[PDB]
Amino acid sequence: MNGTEGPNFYVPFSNKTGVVRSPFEAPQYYLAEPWQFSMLAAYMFLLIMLGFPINFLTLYVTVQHKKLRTPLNYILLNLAVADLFMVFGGFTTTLYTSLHGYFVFGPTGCNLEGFFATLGGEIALWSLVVLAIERYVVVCKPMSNFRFGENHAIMGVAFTWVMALACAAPPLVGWSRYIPEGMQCSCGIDYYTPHEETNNESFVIYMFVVHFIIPLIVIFFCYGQLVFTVKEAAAQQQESATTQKAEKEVTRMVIIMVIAFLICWLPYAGVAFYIFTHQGSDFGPIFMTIPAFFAKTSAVYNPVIYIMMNKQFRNCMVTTLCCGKN
């Protein structure tokens, strides 16, 4: 026996010695040293100090620069708002709780923190899907005489909200559940214990298929088509050095985007798959925070890739931060 079970939790540490306590009631210094809880807090501090300015600045320059308020940019605004739900739903909470060594807000605060942090990351995830569907529709021109307007952009944002609610709300009404994960300082979906009263197994399947595989297929199809269309256009227009440059830039950005998506979600999907197929094995607290580390750092590196590496946003940000220079 490798863990300790409670009504609303699973502590990944055996109670053979009798030292295990409810992660809602007492510190968990028996599954990690205090200095590791301090390093957890230090990491949350890093993600706040970087993730908040980068994502807030994205909203701010959009308010100050008229040319940013285009429909194809709406979804990037959505990305920045979603990353802020991650910053204040999860990161700040986990900074606070880690300094106590346990989840001081109780089962209720566990559902709040789990709902808003999972909602933030799922809005961000489906924003990357919708961004690719749109780029594919606009560049590859799969439809006859279709012009992408403001109402399509709003439809795309609402679709991300609905898809993220379809992931974050069921654990509040009895399909899966929210419990403290890893070092017991942050709450997330229970994708690792076979809690049958909330039907965890079928929810993890539904998560794996609908919120990982389908986003993976759509992103790969849409950008595969986009790279193919751009390479086809450049091959048929080799007298244009700019078009050859565009082809190289699009291919480089597409590689960065799909690699960044894999770095963000493949560890969560891999660990969940391994736990699913090897049901009945020891999975420690710090090992469980590895896929959390990868997914949460995307609140910093997604806006670097999708905002700061975008010519228009970078120009306006530099202008805003340097008071008025180019």
Binding site: L76, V138, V139, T243, A246, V250
Partner: peptide, 11 residues
Amino acid sequence: ILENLKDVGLF
């Protein structure tokens, strides 16, 4: 294709 690439933020 170039104008569409600029619109979507890829070039």
